[PDB]
Design a protein around this ligand. Sequence first.
Ligand code: NA
Ligand code: NA
Ligand code: NA
Lengths: 596, 596, 596
Amino acid sequence: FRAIIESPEGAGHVGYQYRRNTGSTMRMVSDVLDERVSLWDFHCDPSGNVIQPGPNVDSRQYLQAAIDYVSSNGGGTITIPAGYTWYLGSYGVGGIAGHSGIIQLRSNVNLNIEGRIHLSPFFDLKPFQVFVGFDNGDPASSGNLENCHIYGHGVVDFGGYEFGASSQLRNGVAFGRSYNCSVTGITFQNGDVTWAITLGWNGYGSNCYVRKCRFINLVNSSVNANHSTVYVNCPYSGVESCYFSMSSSFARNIACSVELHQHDTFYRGSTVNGYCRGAYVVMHAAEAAGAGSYAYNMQVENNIAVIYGQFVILGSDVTATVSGHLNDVIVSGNIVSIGERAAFSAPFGAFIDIGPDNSGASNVQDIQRVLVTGNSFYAPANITDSAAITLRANLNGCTFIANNFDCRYMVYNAPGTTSPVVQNLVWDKSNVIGGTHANQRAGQNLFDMQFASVVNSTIEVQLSCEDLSMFSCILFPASCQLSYSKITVDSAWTKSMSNTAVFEGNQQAGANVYVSYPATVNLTSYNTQGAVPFFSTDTNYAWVTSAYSLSINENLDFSPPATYTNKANGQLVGVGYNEIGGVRSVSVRLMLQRQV
Amino acid sequence: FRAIIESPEGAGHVGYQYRRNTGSTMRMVSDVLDERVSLWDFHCDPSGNVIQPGPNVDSRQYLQAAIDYVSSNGGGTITIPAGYTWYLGSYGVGGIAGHSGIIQLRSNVNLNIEGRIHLSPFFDLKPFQVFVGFDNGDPASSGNLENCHIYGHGVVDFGGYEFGASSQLRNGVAFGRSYNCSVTGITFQNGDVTWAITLGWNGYGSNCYVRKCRFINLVNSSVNANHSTVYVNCPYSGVESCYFSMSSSFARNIACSVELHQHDTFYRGSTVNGYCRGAYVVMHAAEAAGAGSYAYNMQVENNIAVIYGQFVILGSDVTATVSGHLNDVIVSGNIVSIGERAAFSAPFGAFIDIGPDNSGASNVQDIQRVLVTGNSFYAPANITDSAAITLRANLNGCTFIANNFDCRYMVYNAPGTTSPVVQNLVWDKSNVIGGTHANQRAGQNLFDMQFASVVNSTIEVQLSCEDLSMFSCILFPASCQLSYSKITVDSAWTKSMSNTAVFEGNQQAGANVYVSYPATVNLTSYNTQGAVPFFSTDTNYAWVTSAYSLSINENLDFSPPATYTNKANGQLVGVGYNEIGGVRSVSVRLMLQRQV
Amino acid sequence: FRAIIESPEGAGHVGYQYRRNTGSTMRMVSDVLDERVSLWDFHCDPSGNVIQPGPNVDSRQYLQAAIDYVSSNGGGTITIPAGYTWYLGSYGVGGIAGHSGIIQLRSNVNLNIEGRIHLSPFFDLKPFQVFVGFDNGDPASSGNLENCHIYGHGVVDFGGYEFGASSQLRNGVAFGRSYNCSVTGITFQNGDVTWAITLGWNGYGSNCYVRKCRFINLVNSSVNANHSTVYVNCPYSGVESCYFSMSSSFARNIACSVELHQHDTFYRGSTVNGYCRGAYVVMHAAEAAGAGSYAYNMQVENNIAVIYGQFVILGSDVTATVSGHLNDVIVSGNIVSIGERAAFSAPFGAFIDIGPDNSGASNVQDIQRVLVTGNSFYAPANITDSAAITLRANLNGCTFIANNFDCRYMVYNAPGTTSPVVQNLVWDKSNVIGGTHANQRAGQNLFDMQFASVVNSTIEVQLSCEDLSMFSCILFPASCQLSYSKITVDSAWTKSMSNTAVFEGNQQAGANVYVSYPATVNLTSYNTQGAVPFFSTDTNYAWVTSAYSLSINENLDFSPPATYTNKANGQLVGVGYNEIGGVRSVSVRLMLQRQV
Ligand code: NA
Ligand code: NA
Ligand code: NA
């Protein structure tokens, strides 16, 4: 008896009945204990004696054994105990070997990380992926990870070790071909990694989520070639109520918080600080095997960010056999600011970027039906390289409504460089243009339409304060075609502007071009007493359909025409009134209108 | 001693003190074990021996006993163990009998479902409600369920069995008259049911929530008469960060993801696929006993959906003694699309539907103060039956601002059928009208105002591309009264349209009707040299207050009037200018304005 | 053996091996039990015998001991058992003494409150703070609370006891200088307190959150001087998916649900009922030590509320050495209503309030770059004291876009009282003005611009129904300066209004003032046949740049001018047309325009 009770089967010979209930199951102590399971149950030497965790012990083989055993039982949750730091100090083996895998996740085996997991000095200067859900070296020959949840109040610490080379990959949790998997509550911190979490693989996966997780200082070296904290690469997956922070200078140039790469994915309720970018929202053709070649229903909403580059970078590219498409996106409720910095010191500040592909090609995209609404954007007044939308690649549609944009540019693209084809750009008049950059815009165009062409587009400029420093509210170079488009400049705060709307190739004369903007016109009248016509002295208003006065008449003996039309020769003509006769000569501020 | 230790009281005679702390309580092993509790503690035969779960065992009596026992202790959480499937194979008894109840929930007894719960072939072809919080057959004679939470990573599987008859009801969790109850993390799957979760009962209840739950393939038969995945029927209750998916053809015609039926309820952060409808937002007078006769503070926000019918269906009906009212609703941030399908193959595609009551009556509603803002809606170009708002019943107010609507119709109602009375419909100009359906609108009206009357309403039409296929941007039949309303068509992309705004009963002549729209007018001038009047040849502009040119003057020897007013006889009249005398005859595009 | 097994070390001599796995660690029963920990392990008398909880026992010393012990082990989670009420009946000691502290929180020690915690009659009429994370009397000399999480389905009950005096402070959870701390799932109820949760202290702290918590009846006495349910006073912290309810009359006058006092803080997804206020969003200079003197990235979004005072109260104040600043705020998606009540019976109803400081000073603020968009606001028609924005202090910027405001006033400030300096107030035309208060506005101005000055501001008034009861759509007293501003009144529903826009000091004549509004003008023409001028009989249109007809011409023999300009003497002048000669005299509705 004493032999049995002191042996490992001793709890299995001690009876128990729930709260002495006569109806309850007659069990043994071991049975109630077998309901839960922890790392302590596999953290032992060959002779079954428990090993204590610490900086001089590799917990990898033990945690792996635990995962492998519970995998056999059909599932369950392993606890990684609180009040202990569990150091990992070696590479995993078999299926995860090809992915630099430390621990292999398995279906139905959840990890409750309450304690801390720290990478040992073994992993300094080399690649690693701390948790991997692939069961094969080649991911195309891998099976799925299902129903695997990592959660708790625990920490995952990458040791603070730098990358050994730019080519190396480093990840916290690679769920792999992951269906119904999540990370909740976990702090990932102190490292130099490519991602902290990757969800899915080339579209394979579903219902994967990252929630209430923290991501702190996950870039620290100039070697690090790129970073995206959470990579969503399966559909019906997303990031929610998370926190992302960086302090590293290098992070401001390379780090993005989230990437959405498949349909029905989201990023919301999250706070970001110290990153270059908020989110990539893209279809990479090379990732279209699992969930097809379209990224639709892409949601970036109610996020808070202090970034140094671009907030949302839209993108779409092609392979030889597959073409990427992006459509039905929504960016709403976000309050974003470019952080304090020198002009041109980080990648170009923007709220929306229509970026080219990895290879720098700008003539492969298919971005359309994008709604940008109810967002707040601010950039410090000194930051020249700041824009509401940086439009550097072919755009098939994007709609801006009821946003608040307080930065240097509204619409922008560098002169030279790319020559984007633009369709269906809608800038509703409900977008407010802020005044922080007033007086800073010497020689610059508020909307600098540096494109190959613009069609089926609306730009309704409305100012809410003066900036007479800008060269124009909106400018089109002669190289930019314009047709079936609406371009207006509201007169408010524009009276003293020499240029409002500028069409360098006279593109506002287009048969289906709808424009209105203020201009200053010199008029001469005939000498006739009574009703008398006034004509403009310049002859470049052949495109004008109507014009009306925006200035007072300080004269008593006459009044120029309130409204005007044009003549074959490009003069404006109206009918004023001479109370007394005499040739009149005035300079008046007119709202020039064409088919509007 | 050995007798005691091996018996069921053996753990109660084995001492324990937390981590050998001298200050800790001296307890027995049983006591620490009595803190937690699982299904294993009640899953036994009469002789106390544990029964193993499986497809040939009914776990119902055991789970019920567990719930009944913990209910007596005052509360606690029962675990349904992971790595086991717990098959249910019989009806429950007593209070839940009248509700086809399987398991009876009780106050303060939470169910941690980590394992799987599967319905046995017993329940094929008959009704069931797997969890019921009613304690009585008649729900009006039932007490409350309080502080009852069902959560975990577990699955609830309905077996995939079809309904036996349309009359049958099937539910996953009927919380009943439920206060502080929730379902979190649970996957409900593989079935044919009326609802998966019902919260509250006719307004009785509070603080009930469904979060992070998954709902997969819960309709599979033509017998199934109706489905709504989550039914919210108590105030201060809602659905949050959930996932709803269907593959069944039948689901596209009958299935709705959520219904909000009482005040202060919400649906947000959720993804829907394969449903007919997103949400019903309604006051049913028959459900007004618990929380009164008003549904106010109704929030549908930040959801993603691919549906085949209507996204949000607003509704309000009456009984002999009670009348339903709906007001103070908000629909924001949602990105919805009608899924790929043939025209007219599922219920009419719409973003907002103002539906009639169950009985088809359209003259009982009281829907007002509804805000629809910052949403994205898309329907494939072939889908004729798609609309921003389908307005088929009496409407007392709905406000559209800064939405993106890319579908066949903006405002729509079938000609014939109903004759809705419409008050306070506000379509702000900040709503963008998409171009996907351009060229598809032969013989159709973009805003087809098929109503009995329209009052205190605003329709500010703004196009962002051409569609000359449409018959009109907006049309009112002579049967539709119009008063104290504003109806405008912006000129952008409208130059080549024969009809822009059409008032078939000349309703734009109304004393308090404010309209502006483009039209083509033929004018003849007198021969007088100098200032010379032009008059329209048609005499139907007696309602016009002002008009101005939208076209150029290609002539040199004269210029028609820039602006016009009218005469008693319905002619337009302006003052142009003959440089040389002669009778002039022109056809000009005018913006016709009335009191605007 | 029997001696050992029955003693407290008995579980430590009973062997166990996880599920009889030969690879699993050979442990003792005690070891598996030592993984979890509860209040039962410290809830005993000096002799180690367990004490049962109840209304005649003080659980404070026992819970404290438990917290102190687990603090030593490095961390872990203590459970407060379900099915038991744990009464607290004494003050804590040492570091928390100066804060009226009951229990002292410590780093890494989480409290799983599943049971109920009730304050005993000891605490009636005196102050208390049930949980305190300060370790010192003076908070400036306190260390941090880190990684401390309070969660579960449990209740925290304040006993229902009233305050003994207004000076007393009462709190549920004072996290103190708190980093990575949270309260989740907990119901705080039945009391009279200053706050339920306070996060951070004067800016020190990070990543603190309140989620899924309930707050019910936490004010009940006229003694209670103030209440804010959750006070966020550290950065990167926020409230999410919470519920706040009051029934007390006193709560409607003093209670606010949330306060955001540091940068990157949020309040969203929450429901509020019975409060005076929704949220304070403020920088108090006195709280600028920890996180600096700027509150930026302040997010109030997707909340539901029935309040009786102000929804969001913006604020900013100064000390002798520090000045507060507030900027980059966003208020979106909220649906708020003033609850049913008598006019002037609670603090002034408003959606946004720009309040003065505590000391009533209105000339210290620095509020700018605030976006208010996509919100719904309603106030019962009888409530005179209701406004979209109550602007009672100096404002440096606030932008309103695409909101739905259905209340008595749009912009308001009491005449007399304060004289706010206003810059950058942008009221976009996409804001809808509701009609619930139509006919109630006798002698009142819809926008009552009672300010010292207004500059760089936009007010685009758009009505959607008639209200001829109002004195004006917008009024500026002669004391209010106006410059570099845009003020427009759309003509829709305004035809029968005697006053539309009123400038009592003729401020619309300002050189950079851009206005348009309807007015009624009397005109007389000369007798000349043919083209003939009409002049206004009044001479106060010297500021007018253009004007156009808003009324029909019922005459046949002549037509007045469609458009007009002005003369040096302040007359309007246009060119009409006399078909037959004769002096004409008409009264016409004109849209008066200035530089627009
Ligand atoms: Na070109
Ligand atoms: Na009718
Ligand atoms: Na003044």
